[PDB]
Write a protein that binds this ligand. Sequence first.
Ligand SMILES: CCN(CC)C(=O)[C@@H]1C=C2c3cccc4[nH]cc(c34)C[C@H]2N(C)C1
Length: 245
Amino acid sequence: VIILTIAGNILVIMAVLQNATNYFLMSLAIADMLLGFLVMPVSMLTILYGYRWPSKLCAVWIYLDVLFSTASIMHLCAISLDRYVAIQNPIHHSRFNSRTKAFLKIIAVWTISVGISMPIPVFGLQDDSKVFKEGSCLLADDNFVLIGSFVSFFIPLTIMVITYFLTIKSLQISNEQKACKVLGIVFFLFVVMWCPFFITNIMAVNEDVIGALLNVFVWIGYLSSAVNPLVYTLFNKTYRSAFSR
Ligand SMILES: CCN(CC)C(=O)[C@@H]1C=C2c3cccc4[nH]cc(c34)C[C@H]2N(C)C1
């Protein structure tokens, strides 16, 4: 999954197709390539050593994990919200797009990503038990998980549910039907690969059963960083040719 993530994103970074909307997909592919080289391979060492953490970098590793995970989720939310306005009223969307929105959009999805994960090393790096190890380097803040995973997933999820319901409502002519199938695959994969981890994360707060469930579901969430390059790009004839060359 690590090799797949890195090899999938470094093939999308070169291919950039210099559109104002395609550059935003490079900012999404940069939030996942970093996730695939800094955060993800560290967890492979933890899997090898059986949850024992080789010590002051544990709070740093969680900071990057929350940062790149929230940066990815709101990249897809911004894409989904932008894709709805481009489909509802395309005339008024083209007038107000001067290649400054795309730079203003990268600012917004990285200000909230870095603003939500800022409590981790500013209050939690001094305390070695709040955002810190139970012997295993977990995120033991029981009140930040409830509200920090609420605005990071469930608010981007209720935004995506209304955006997806409204977009399909406004898309209903084969090209419109081909697009409706692309939205379904994109929406279904984001839910099925991130939602399983977040219900288990918050329902938890038998330990052995839940400890095994959260272990596998974490890697299902990581695996979505290998797929995001493909489902958001490879539907384009140009990208398929670019990957082959
Ligand atoms: C096994 C230990 N690890 C790995 C460092 C975690 O618990 C990570 C903690 C996360 C987490 C907590 C709280 C809020 C959040 N938003 C987004 C994420 C998040 C990402 C999420 N990653 C995928 C797992």
